[PDB]
Chain A
Amino acid sequence: MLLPKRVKYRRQHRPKTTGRSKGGNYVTFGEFGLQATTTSWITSRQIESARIAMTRYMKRGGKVWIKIFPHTPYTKKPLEVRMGAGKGAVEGWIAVVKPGRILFEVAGVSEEVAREALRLASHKLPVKTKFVKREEL
Chain B
Amino acid sequence: KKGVSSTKNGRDSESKRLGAKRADGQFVTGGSILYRQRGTKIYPGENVGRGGDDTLFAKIDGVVKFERKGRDKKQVSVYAVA
List the interface of chain A (C-beta within 8 A of B): 81-82, 84-87
Shortest beta-carbon distance from B57 to chain A in Å: 39
Asked if residues A86 and B1 are in contact (CB atoms below 8 Å), the reply is: no
Contact sample, A vs B, 15 pairs, CB 8 Å cutoff? A81-B2, A81-B5, A82-B1, A82-B2, A84-B1, A84-B2, A85-B2, A85-B3, A85-B5, A85-B6, A85-B7, A86-B5, A86-B6, A86-B7, A87-B7
Q: Is the interface of A mostly helix, strand, loop or mixed?
A: loop
Give bound CA distance, A87 to B3, whole Å: 14
Tell me which of A82, A84, A86, A87 has the highest count of chain B C-beta atoms within 10 A of its own C-beta.
A86
Q: Which A residue's beta carbon lies closest to that of B7?
A: A86
Q: Is the interface of B mostly helix, strand, loop or mixed?
A: loop
Give bound CA distance, A85 to B5, whole Å: 6
Q: What residues of chain B lie closer than 8 Å to A82, measured between beta carbons?
A: 1-2
Give bound CA distance, A85 to B2, whole Å: 7
Give bound CA distance, A51 to B5, whole Å: 39
Q: What residues of chain B lie closer than 8 Å to A86, measured between beta carbons?
A: 5-7
The 10 closest A-B pairs by CB, nearest first: A85-B5, A85-B2, A86-B7, A82-B2, A86-B5, A84-B2, A81-B2, A82-B1, A85-B6, A86-B6
